């Protein structure tokens, strides 16, 4: 085995495969070229016919009336020795130019973005620059570990050829890995853009390829399955914090004690179902209570009714007992296609079968032990939140506020901690109040509710585009959240090098872990300019487990004023322009 000996053999194998695939494809492509030529012919003909119907009177030229000597002329010279041609020049007049803007997607809430290890583009700024100083491009590539798409000795690669190379690599090799780990390193060296090798390893598995899966309960293939398997997808994919599946803002999965619930309540006696209920001989309520009492530790004289249980029905039953805990009355009503007696029968049959600086917040789940100096929350120096799976009365949780009304002063414990109210904790002030009339007694919940003011886009009096407020606002009133992509400090540094060279960045610092980048997707407030004497300020508030940027009025603001805030730079990178008047 040799580190360069794998690559050398890989390169040669790649050249050999590309050949025969192409030699074989030539037969097909030649067949496809003729077919494509047929499509070209038909469609060119259709366009050509449509041209015949049209009459355009083209080719006109004008000289008269004679030039008045106040018009400049256009001269064209010829190699043919024909005299030079001179024509009067017609001016194109007075079209206003719009400030420069690169396109961006709109956002109402921040968006989590993975780091990109290889930049797929070299910014073109430099032809007028004439490469100076070029060390910038060289240091820009340093940040990507020298990885640009696509920089490699080899020329072409595609999914079809890539699989064949891995297969040809496997057969080349003794046997068997069966699928080799050493090799993904070898080809990742030939392809810096494709690397890392583990990414290639995952991508190979993606292309190769249904166990383990649970088919549709609502399906022709429903199978009898344990409760965890039937819910495995909902538990594993749902986000407790923002209530969606595979959310855009929170990268980590279930804790997973968060989906586990209290066994209670209330284990009550309810009867009759009824009337075809699970009654009444010994072991109706008794054998049930006995079995669950026997299972927890660590009759039924009538013969059960003869019914057939579908895959879906059994799996649903196994699900429903987990959440209703022997209330067969309720299980049977929800299963719908069975009755309380039959649910009980099945439980009985089932029992007798034998099994064979600020840091971004994250919830903590150390189930029995308390939130002390080992708890990640206190390690991070952050409160535990409603999302934490610790004790109800954990000392490190933040209580809400009991405020009467606006709680926009230091007397509100929420506001004083630079936290917006909690709709689940601040039950007195109105953060929990009626959602639809979004203006409400609590004035510390604007970011959560997106109660942003109306903003107007127009050319700035200061620089490029600026943003203007339509209707006036009073001091410390909420204007808008500063939304954008959320990215790591490392990723922000790479994007920052290019933004600084370009001379403009939409970067905004969130906390130690993340930065908010309004460049690719963001919202209208992103156009707010810098000013040393601004009329607006920024608070990084902590909002329901998330850090969110809030833009507020530093002073009373009149209609149509342009909004500015202090960027907090050193700095002249590059403003340098505050302020007019």
């Amino acid at each position: 085995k040799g580190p360069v000996c794998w690559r050398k053999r890989v390169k040669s194998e790649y050249m050999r495969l590309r050949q025969l695939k192409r030699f074989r494809r030539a037969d097909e492509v030649k067949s496809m070229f003729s077919s494509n030529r047929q499509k070209i012919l038909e469609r060119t003909e259709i366009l050509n016919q449509e041209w015949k119907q049209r009459r355009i009177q083209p080719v006109h030229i004008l000289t008269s009336v004679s030039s008045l000597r106040g018009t400049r002329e256009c001269s064209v010279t010829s190699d043919l020795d024909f005299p030079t041609q001179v024509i009067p020049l017609k001016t194109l007049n007075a079209v206003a130019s719009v400030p420069i803007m690169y396109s961006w997607s709109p956002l109402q809430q921040n968006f989590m973005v993975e780091d990109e290890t290889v930049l797929h583009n070299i910014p073109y700024m430099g032809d007028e620059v004439l490469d100076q100083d070029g060390t910038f491009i060289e240091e820009l590539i340093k940040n990507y570990d020298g990885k640009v798409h696509g920089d490699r000795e080899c020329g072409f690669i595609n999914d079809e050829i890539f699989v064949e190379l891995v297969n040809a690599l496997g057969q080349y090799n003794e046997s068997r890995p069966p699928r080799s780990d050493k090799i993904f390193e070898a080809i990742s060296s030939m392809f810096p853009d494709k690397g890392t090798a583990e990414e290639l390893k995952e991508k190979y598995k993606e292309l190769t390829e249904p166990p383990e899966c649970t088919p549709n309960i609502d399906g022709p293939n429903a199978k009898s399955v344990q409760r965890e398997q039937s819910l495995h997808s909902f538990h594993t994919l749902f986000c407790r914090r923002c209530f969606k599946y595979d959310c855009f803002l929170h990268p980590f999965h279930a804790t997973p004690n968060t989906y586990k619930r209290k066994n209670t309540e209330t284990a009550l006696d309810n009867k009759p179902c009824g009337p075809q209920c699970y009654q009444h001989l010994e072991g109706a309520k008794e054998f049930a209570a006995a079995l669950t009492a026997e299972r927890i530790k660590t009759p039924n004289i009538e013969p059960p009714e003869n019914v057939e249980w579908s895959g879906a029905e059994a799996s649903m039953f196994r699900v429903l007992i987990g959440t209703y805990y022997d209330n067969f009355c309720a299980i049977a009503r929800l299963i719908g296609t069975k009755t309380c007696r039959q649910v009980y029968e099945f439980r009985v049959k089932e029992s007798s079968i034998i099994a064979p600086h600020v840091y971004n917040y994250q919830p903590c789940d150390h189930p029995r032990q308390p939130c002390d100096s080992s708890c990640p929350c206190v390690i991070a120096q952050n409160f535990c939140e409603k999302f934490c799976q610790c004790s109800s009365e954990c000392q490190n949780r933040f209580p809400g506020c009991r405020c009467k009304a606006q709680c926009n002063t230091k007397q509100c414990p929420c506001y004083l901690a630079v936290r917006e109210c909690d709709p689940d904790l601040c039950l007195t002030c109105g953060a929990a109040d009626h959602w639809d009339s979004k203006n409400v007694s609590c004035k510390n919940c604007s970011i959560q509710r997106g109660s942003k003011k109306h903003l107007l886009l127009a050319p700035s009096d200061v620089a490029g585009w600026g943003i203007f407020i339509k209707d006036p606002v009073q001091k410390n009133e909420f204007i808008s959240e500063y939304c954008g992509e959320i990215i790591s400090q490392d990723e922000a540094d790479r994007r920052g090098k290019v933004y600084d060279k370009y001379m403009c960045s939409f970067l905004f610092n969130l906390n130690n872990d993340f930065v908010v980048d309004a460049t690719r997707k963001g919202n209208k407030i992103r156009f707010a300019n810098h000013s040393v004497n601004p009329n607006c300020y920024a608070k990084v508030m902590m909002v329901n487990g998330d850090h969110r940027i809030g833009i507020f009025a530093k002073r009373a603001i009149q209609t149509g004023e342009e909004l500015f805030f202090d960027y907090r730079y050193s700095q002249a990178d590059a403003l340098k322009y505050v302020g007019i008047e």
Binding site: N143, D493, S505
Partner: peptide, 9 residues
């Protein structure tokens, strides 16, 4: 390497 970023108190 320290790309310029906006900050708040």
């Amino acid at each position: 390497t320290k790309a310029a970023r906006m900050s708040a108190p």
